[PDB]
């Protein structure tokens, strides 16, 4: 649900959003869409501050649900002890 | 005793949740507080959604499912003691109390090597009853619940 189903449309980006800002929305939308289905969980200058506010909160929450409900880190260490 | 339908079931609905529905209901019809109204608000809420989102349809079903299952386990073990009943099945079905059978075999032996007739069905229920008393097992409970059968004439 990460590699596909999301495409940055180069044609319909408004001029008043820089090409880098358009990759922070495609990443906040994907971070919430993936948090619901697969993870199985449910919950200008002020404009630039809104994107970053929606970034430094959603992503920081995605790791918490991915380290407490699934222990993503505890598998990396365990996948070195045995498989390596 | 209800069933499920597949030839009429919707397309986008998976069979997994369909099975979940079939169990959460039959567990009520057979079974004849706050866990009743709150869910009604949840179901009504979905009726307001202008787009059917399966990813949410399950988060309300599974909670309802886990609540009745948690409520049913409370009765199937604590109130209606399953351990005692399983302890009965292991003893008699699976020959757990083998000491009862070596005496029953010792007595009800000649009356079974002959081919079976219409009378042998009662000729053993007594011998089995003579057995439980022969091993000083005195319990009017669970004693008449055990009835040996004779598959005769077919």
Let me know: does A46 contact A40? Beta carbons within 8 Å. no
Which chain B positions have a beta carbon within 8 Å of A36's beta carbon? Answer: 55-56
CB atoms inside a 10 Å sphere around CB B110: 7
Q: Note whether A33 contacts B: Cβ–Cβ < 8 A.
A: no
Q: What does each C-alpha distance from B90 to A37, A60, B95 come to in angstroms?
A: 44, 54, 7
Q: Note whether A42 contacts B: Cβ–Cβ < 8 A.
A: yes
Please name the residue of chain B whose CA is at the shortest distance from the CA of residue A33: B55
- Smallest CA–CA distance, residue B52 to chain A, in Å, is 14
C-alpha to C-alpha distance for A56 and A27, rounded to whole angstroms: 12
* DSSP string over A11-79: SS--TTS-TTTHHHHHHHHHHHHHHHHTTT-----HHHHHHHHHHHHHHHHHHHHHHHSS-HHHHHHHH
C-alpha to C-alpha distance for A38 and A66, rounded to whole angstroms: 11
Please name the residue of chain A whose CA is at the shortest distance from the CA of residue B58: A40
C-alpha to C-alpha distance for A4 and A30, rounded to whole angstroms: 10
Sign of the CA dihedral with A62 first, then A67, A69, and A74 last: positive
Let me know: does A53 contact A79? Beta carbons within 8 Å. no
| Interruption sites in chain A after residues (C→N beyond 2.5 Å) | 43
Let me know: does A1 contact A34? Beta carbons within 8 Å. yes
**Which structure tokens are listed for A7?**
């495409």
**Which structure tokens are listed for B148?**
């040996």
The experimental resolution of this structure, in angstroms, equals 7.7
Q: Note whether A75 contacts B: Cβ–Cβ < 8 A.
A: no
C-alpha to C-alpha distance for B57 and B13, rounded to whole angstroms: 10
**Which structure tokens are listed for B120?**
């042998």
CB atoms inside a 10 Å sphere around CB B140: 6
**Which structure tokens are listed for A41?**
């969980």
Q: Note whether A69 contacts B: Cβ–Cβ < 8 A.
A: no
Report CB contact under 8 Å: A37, B59: no
Report CB contact under 8 Å: A37, B55: yes
CB atoms inside a 10 Å sphere around CB B112: 14
C-alpha to C-alpha distance for B123 and B94, rounded to whole angstroms: 23
Which helix (H) or strand (E) segment holds residue B92: the answer is helix B82-92
- Smallest CA–CA distance, residue B28 to chain A, in Å, is 27
CB atoms inside a 10 Å sphere around CB B131: 21
């Amino acid at each position: 649900l990460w590699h596909d189903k999301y495409t940055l449309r180069k044609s319909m980006i408004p001029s008043f959003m820089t090409m880098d800002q358009s990759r922070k929305v495609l990443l906040i939308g994907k971070s919430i869409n993936f948090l619901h289905q697969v993870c199985h969980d449910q919950t200008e200058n002020a404009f630039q501050g809104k994107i970053d506010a929606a970034y430094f909160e959603t992503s920081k929450y995605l790791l918490d649900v991915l380290n407490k409900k699934y222990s993503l880190l505890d598998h990396m260490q365990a996948m070195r002890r045995y498989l390596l | 005793q209800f069933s499920l339908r597949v030839e009429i079931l919707p397309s986008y609905i998976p069979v997994r949740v369909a099975e979940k529905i079939l169990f959460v209901g039959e567990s009520v019809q057979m079974f004849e507080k706050n866990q009743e109204d709150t869910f009604a608000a949840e179901l009504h809420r979905l009726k307001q959604q202008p787009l059917f989102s399966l990813v949410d349809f399950e988060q309300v079903v599974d909670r309802i499912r886990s609540t009745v299952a948690e409520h049913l386990w409370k009765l199937m073990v604590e109130e209606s003691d399953l351990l005692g009943q399983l302890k009965i099945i292991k003893d008699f079905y699976l020959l757990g109390r083998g000491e009862l059978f070596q005496a029953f075999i010792d007595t009800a032996q000649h009356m079974l090597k002959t081919p079976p007739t219409a009378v042998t069905e009662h000729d053993v229920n007594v011998a089995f009853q003579q057995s439980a008393h022969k091993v000083l097992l005195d319990d009017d409970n669970l004693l008449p619940l055990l009835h040996l059968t004779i598959e005769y004439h077919g």
